[PDB]
Write a protein that binds this ligand. Structure first.
Ligand SMILES: [Ca+2]
Ligand SMILES: [Ca+2]
Ligand SMILES: [Ca+2]
Ligand SMILES: [Ca+2]
Ligand SMILES: [Ca+2]
Ligand SMILES: [Ca+2]
Ligand SMILES: [Ca+2]
Ligand SMILES: [Zn+2]
Lengths: 66, 318
């Protein structure tokens, strides 16, 4: 049902209150890069993609200990 | 608690003879270790743990509880860098360096890229939450700030994501040396983040100076990563292998370099690049003082070679 993705934003068009509108919520707003970690419904990826303030959406990948 | 021994790896990277000059205890210098957390009260580590934080699930927490090591890997890595030089246990490459333990991997030893990225931001921001308090552009090596000078990542994955790279770049531009494990699949090149140009990819050698079969190829440098004895929970010790074990050796070396340079000059060295073969950059120094194994020059197995603290510090101060 929900998925966590990282959205690179256009700071000229972004306000964190925009996420709720597509069914999501913010997990973390980066201080040093223009990006936000968000939880959204899994069938909402396409919809996000088409949003003006969205520059890139990336899935949350896995790293492992070496 | 057992009597202190110097693990073969610490000997191999020529750390003991540096300690008279510095053991890394220069106050402006911190090493951030982004890993499974830390046994924060381990008697061989506690005095060097300067900050214990977690970024798991995207929530920044300093609850000692949330930041403690539930795997052991983190504790082991940290002990290779910063185990205290005393009467017990082991001893790190830089046995007086301050550590920031940033827990970005969970009890399983796995982590989200997002959590790692947050982890890198915390290393930059420091406990005060602000990267550059006085706005002068100087972050790493500014005594007014509390940024780490080294970011050590004994972890990796196959994805190359732009946001994580953007954060890597932020670290590099803050003047922080980034060090990462090359990976353990015997692959032809390093995993991420080691494969970024701004990061030092580290391969693993064994005690016979051979490259480990599992070591991802084409690293920048190499270091001890087979049969590595270090700290482990709870208040104990264990022997492990991996490019995760080699990486802290390198981070320790870099800590010594920056500490020694700051002690003498009141500044740190620039990070430098992969190609650097000069004395005016950390990475340049690492490359020219490494023990060139295998075929002459940089090669796919050992990189430029095995890091040597003693020689790197001499080059830095000369
Ligand atoms: Ca610092
Ligand atoms: Ca303990
Ligand atoms: Ca000790
Ligand atoms: Ca700070
Ligand atoms: Ca500053
Ligand atoms: Ca300053
Ligand atoms: Ca060689
Ligand atoms: Zn959520």
């Amino acid at each position: 049902n929900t998925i966590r993705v990282i959205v690179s934003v256009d700071k000229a068009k972004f306000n964190p209150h925009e996420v709720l509108g597509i069914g999501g919520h913010i997990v973390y707003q980066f201080k040093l890069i223009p990006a936000v970690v968000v939880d959204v419904p899994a069938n909402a990826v396409g919809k996000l993609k088409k949003m003006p303030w969205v520059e890139k959406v990336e899935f949350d990948h896995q790293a492992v200990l070496l | 608690q057992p009597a202190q021994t110097i693990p073969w790896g610490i000997e191999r990277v020529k750390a003991p003879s540096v300690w008279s000059i510095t053991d890394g205890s220069v106050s402006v210098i911190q090493v951030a270790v982004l890993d499974t957390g830390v046994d924060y009260d381990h008697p061989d580590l506690a005095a060097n743990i300067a900050w214990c934080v977690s970024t798991l699930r995207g929530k920044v927490s300093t609850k000692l509880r949330d930041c403690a090591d539930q795997n052991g890997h983190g504790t082991h890595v940290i002990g290779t860098i910063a185990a205290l030089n005393n009467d017990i246990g082991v001893v790190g490459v830089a046995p007086g360096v301050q550590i920031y333990s940033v827990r970005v991997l969970d009890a399983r030893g796995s982590g989200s890229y997002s959590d790692i990225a947050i982890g890198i931001e915390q290393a930059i921001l420091g406990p005060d939450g602000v990267a550059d308090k006085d706005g002068d552009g100087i972050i790493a090596g500014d005594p007014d700030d509390d940024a780490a000078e080294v970011i050590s990542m004994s972890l990796g994955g196959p994805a190359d994501d732009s946001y994580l790279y953007d954060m890597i770049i932020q670290a590099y531009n803050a003047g922080i040396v980034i060090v990462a494990a090359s990976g353990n699949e015997g692959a032809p090149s390093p995993s991420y983040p080691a494969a970024y140009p701004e990061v030092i990819a580290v391969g693993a050698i064994d005690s016979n100076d051979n490259i480990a079969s599992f070591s991802n190829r084409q690293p920048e440098v190499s270091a001890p990563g087979v049969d590595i004895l270090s700290t482990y929970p709870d208040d104990s010790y264990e022997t492990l292998m991996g490019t995760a074990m080699a990486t802290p050796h390198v981070s320790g070396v870099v800590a010594l370099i920056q500490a020694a340079y700051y002690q003498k000059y009141g500044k740190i060295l620039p990070v430098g690049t992969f190609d650097d073969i000069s004395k005016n950059t950390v990475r340049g120094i690492l490359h020219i003082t490494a023990d060139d194994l295998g075929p002459t020059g940089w090669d796919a197995d050992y990189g430029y070679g095995v890091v040597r603290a003693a020689l790197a510090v001499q080059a830095a101060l000369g």
